[PDB]
Amino acid sequence: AMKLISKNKSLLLDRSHVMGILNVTPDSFSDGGQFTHLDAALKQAEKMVKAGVSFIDIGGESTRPGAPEVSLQEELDRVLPIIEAIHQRFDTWISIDTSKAVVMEEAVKVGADLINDVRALQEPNALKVAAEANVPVCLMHMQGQPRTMQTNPSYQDLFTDISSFLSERIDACQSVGIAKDKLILDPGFGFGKTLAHNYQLLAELERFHQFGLPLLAGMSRKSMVFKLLDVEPKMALSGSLACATIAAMKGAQIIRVHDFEQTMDIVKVCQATLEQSPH
Amino acid sequence: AMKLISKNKSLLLDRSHVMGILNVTPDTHLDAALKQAEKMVKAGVSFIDIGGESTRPGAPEVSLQEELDRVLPIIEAIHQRFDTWISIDTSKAVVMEEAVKVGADLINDVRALQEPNALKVAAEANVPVCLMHMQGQPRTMQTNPSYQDLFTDISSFLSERIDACQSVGIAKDKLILDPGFGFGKTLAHNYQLLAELERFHQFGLPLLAGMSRKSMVFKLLDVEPKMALSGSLACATIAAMKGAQIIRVHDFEQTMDIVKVCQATLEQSP
């Protein structure tokens, strides 16, 4: 089984690890960095640590659609104090969820261990900053148009576009000194895909181990769950747990979720099943 | 994909169907049980399983009259209001007979019709029957003592039961196989059974998987059975991905969501 290394920290990926989403959007009575904002984040982080979460994914994207805008400084004011406080208190890995080179750079400086980038280090300066940061990076593939199977166009060709993407990104990473063992692959559930396409990606998720990188599956509360079930994203827990269970049975090494206490239970069930499975 | 027939009723087992466990023991009032049954119907549950004596190990032993008084009123009230299949969870021939008379559509028998008069009553009832295999002693693999031989005992049991059923006029297409999660198995044995559950389709019967809130979940997680929802949903998901046609559960609303997700994933497996 692969070992993931971030400077002095190491994680053996011999099982599915849970990454808990800690969004640090303040409530409507708080500002980033204020006492109540940091307290609320730290209490959530402590619950994640107690539950056995392996990564805390800190993201400064606004989840408040009624807030008009968020300045870069405000985003830094919301992520940097929380990262600093967690880093000083817990050994748990911290992920910074960003595509912005400036946020990557500043976040690693105060203790982030991993960069989770839905733009796969393609923003200006992001590749250079990730190389200097010397931490692992999750690269997400954001497919453009769907591409059907020639032999049965009811289904997708899941591999042509990501193969080209990955070979180019691994080459780019190598060119700035980021070795392939620092990379994690997120195949990119969501982002405009149909329900069929998303569930085909899940159905075939184990085939993505062929690229030789650990897999991150992020399905939690996404439209592939709540539109299938015709519910609001807040009613989507059970469906999200089923997606997490199927991904864990297919060996996804990192499962990125909102509902981390419940997901810790399902990866334990999956690991017990895998331990009693033949080969 | 098989078709299950109970007299006038029919179900096509081309996907995972949910059977909801209806609580009618003090382990409660009649209108609460009917309201729970109505919630099951609205959620899309295919079978309502009614039992007046629990089959959990260590459960109280219930008199015959008490078992009848627990199940007959709720079966009648559901049958009057809904077309949903009712299962009677019993090993007693007298309960089987009286339950079908007031509306039960399926017999779920942990003792696989081995109790006195059960086989003849099931035949006269002319309804499908879930037969559970209850292995009394583990059997390890002859070449690997760390793992179980999952098939020798159930194969011998099923051939005997299928032949006994045929002798009283119960055809194979009436039979459902429950491989018997729980019932004193170790954690390893229970999870190997789950890990290999798709191998049990070889016997040509629809499978019933019932793992909900059992010790294989709450003792694995080291939690109280009341905290076993998420783990039970994972078990249900694994069983549904392995094609179990009937999944028997307490948390029926959540399990309908997981079987929908499983069905969508199975539909996209090219």
Side-chain angles (χ1 to χ4, degrees), chain A residues 1-231 233 235-279, chain B residues 1-26 28-34 36-38 40-41 43-55 57-270:
Chain A
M2 330 176 66
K3 190 112 55 199
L4 187 70
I5 295 166
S6 180
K7 303 178 190 171
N8 56 303
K9 301 190 180 187
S10 195
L11 271 166
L12 179 66
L13 305 180
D14 67 337
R15 63 195 61 230
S16 295
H17 289 257
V18 173
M19 167 179 286
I21 297 166
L22 198 180
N23 187 275
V24 295
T25 303
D27 63 47
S28 60
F29 284 85
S30 312
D31 294 316
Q34 279 191 335
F35 178 81
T36 50
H37 178 247
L38 188 44
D39 198 25
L42 272 166
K43 289 176 190 175
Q44 281 310 291
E46 185 161 24
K47 274 172 42 78
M48 288 183 182
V49 176
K50 188 226 194 146
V53 174
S54 292
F55 311 85
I56 301 170
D57 190 43
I58 301 282
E61 311 69 11
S62 175
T63 56
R64 278 226 284 158
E69 67 180 29
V70 181
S71 72
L72 180 48
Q73 195 53 54
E74 190 46 31
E75 162 160 2
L76 293 170
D77 293 351
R78 291 164 183 198
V79 305
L80 298 183
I82 293 168
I83 292 180
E84 168 178 67
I86 293 168
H87 166 77
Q88 289 171 352
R89 289 172 189 231
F90 303 110
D91 297 84
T92 307
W93 286 49
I94 300 170
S95 174
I96 177 65
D97 176 9
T98 188
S99 313
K100 303 180 188 185
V102 172
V103 176
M104 288 174 201
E105 181 165 43
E106 294 303 317
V108 172
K109 286 186 198 307
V110 293
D113 303 300
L114 183 157
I115 292 162
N116 181 22
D117 187 3
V118 295
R119 297 196 186 279
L121 306 179
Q122 298 174 282
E123 295 288 284
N125 296 317
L127 194 59
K128 176 199 200 104
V129 158
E132 296 173 343
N134 193 34
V135 299
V137 183
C138 176
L139 309 172
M140 198 196 77
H141 177 233
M142 181 165 73
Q143 181 155 327
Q145 288 304 99
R147 181 188 296 274
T148 52
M149 268 186 206
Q150 241 89 84
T151 59
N152 184 348
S154 293
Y155 299 96
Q156 298 299 123
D157 175 348
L158 302 172
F159 303 102
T160 294
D161 296 304
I162 193 166
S163 289
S164 282
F165 160 84
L166 259 181
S167 75
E168 183 274 332
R169 288 284 82 199
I170 290 169
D171 198 17
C173 284
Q174 181 150 320
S175 81
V176 296
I178 301 165
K180 187 180 170 182
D181 63 10
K182 288 292 176 262
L183 301 182
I184 295 155
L185 177 63
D186 176 350
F189 291 100
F191 299 85
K193 295 174 186 61
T194 63
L195 286 171
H197 188 169
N198 278 320
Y199 281 104
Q200 196 192 330
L201 182 46
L202 180 58
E204 302 209 78
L205 187 63
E206 82 276 6
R207 303 182 62 185
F208 286 77
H209 294 300
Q210 274 294 290
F211 294 109
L213 298 184
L215 304 183
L216 184 152
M219 305 146 306
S220 179
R221 304 188 186 165
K222 274 184 182 169
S223 72
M224 75 186 275
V225 181
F226 62 79
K227 285 182 162 312
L228 178 79
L229 300 179
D230 195 18
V231 299
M235 290 300 100
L237 169 65
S238 298
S240 291
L241 296 178
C243 289
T245 300
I246 298 163
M249 290 301 301
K250 284 168 189 294
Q253 290 95 331
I254 305 173
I255 305 175
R256 176 178 182 274
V257 302
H258 303 84
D259 306 282
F260 59 85
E261 282 165 347
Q262 298 90 338
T263 304
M264 282 305 299
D265 288 358
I266 76 94
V267 302
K268 284 182 189 160
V269 176
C270 292
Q271 177 64 21
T273 304
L274 294 162
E275 292 167 347
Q276 303 302 323
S277 302
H279 57 64
Chain B
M2 289 160 291
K3 186 163 88 168
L4 203 57
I5 304 302
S6 181
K7 299 190 234 97
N8 299 334
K9 295 184 199 194
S10 172
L11 268 176
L12 164 71
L13 297 183
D14 72 331
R15 70 199 47 230
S16 282
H17 285 79
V18 171
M19 166 186 287
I21 301 165
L22 190 61
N23 178 23
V24 305
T25 60
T28 287
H29 53 124
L30 172 59
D31 261 35
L34 187 58
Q36 283 305 296
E38 186 180 50
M40 282 176 68
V41 173
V45 168
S46 290
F47 311 83
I48 302 164
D49 192 40
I50 296 171
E53 168 180 277
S54 167
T55 66
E61 228 156 74
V62 182
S63 73
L64 171 66
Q65 193 55 65
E66 182 63 23
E67 189 162 349
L68 290 174
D69 299 353
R70 281 173 191 188
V71 300
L72 292 183
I74 185 53
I75 293 175
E76 181 177 9
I78 296 176
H79 173 79
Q80 167 184 130
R81 290 168 169 78
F82 309 110
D83 297 317
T84 305
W85 288 50
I86 297 163
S87 169
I88 177 67
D89 182 353
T90 191
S91 298
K92 282 184 232 174
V94 163
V95 176
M96 256 170 237
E97 180 174 301
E98 295 304 325
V100 170
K101 281 181 183 172
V102 300
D105 302 297
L106 189 148
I107 296 158
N108 183 196
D109 184 7
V110 299
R111 291 201 187 272
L113 302 179
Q114 296 177 103
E115 293 311 274
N117 302 311
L119 205 48
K120 172 208 77 127
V121 162
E124 294 166 344
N126 193 26
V127 292
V129 181
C130 176
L131 308 177
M132 199 192 302
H133 180 229
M134 185 183 62
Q135 190 165 327
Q137 166 80 354
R139 176 185 302 266
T140 52
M141 280 166 48
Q142 291 184 81
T143 55
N144 194 331
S146 293
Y147 299 99
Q148 297 294 304
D149 171 354
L150 296 176
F151 302 96
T152 288
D153 292 311
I154 193 166
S155 289
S156 166
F157 154 90
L158 208 32
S159 61
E160 188 279 317
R161 289 283 78 195
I162 286 173
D163 279 349
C165 284
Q166 176 183 249
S167 75
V168 297
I170 303 169
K172 190 171 175 186
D173 61 4
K174 289 272 182 269
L175 302 174
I176 300 154
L177 177 65
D178 177 350
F181 285 103
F183 295 87
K185 297 175 178 63
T186 66
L187 284 180
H189 188 166
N190 277 134
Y191 277 106
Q192 185 189 337
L193 182 58
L194 184 53
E196 300 207 73
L197 186 63
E198 79 276 8
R199 279 183 66 185
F200 286 79
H201 294 298
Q202 75 180 71
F203 299 107
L205 303 180
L207 304 182
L208 183 150
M211 324 159 73
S212 180
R213 289 186 206 168
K214 287 186 169 169
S215 66
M216 71 187 280
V217 180
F218 61 85
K219 290 186 190 168
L220 180 76
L221 302 179
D222 203 37
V223 301
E224 298 300 317
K226 74 175 79 166
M227 297 299 100
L229 166 63
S230 298
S232 301
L233 296 179
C235 283
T237 296
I238 296 161
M241 291 299 300
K242 294 174 180 289
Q245 290 97 332
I246 302 174
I247 298 171
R248 177 183 183 269
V249 305
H250 301 89
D251 306 286
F252 60 84
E253 288 187 0
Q254 298 89 335
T255 306
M256 299 286 316
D257 288 359
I258 77 95
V259 297
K260 286 184 189 314
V261 172
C262 289
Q263 176 68 193
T265 305
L266 291 166
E267 286 167 356
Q268 303 300 326
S269 306

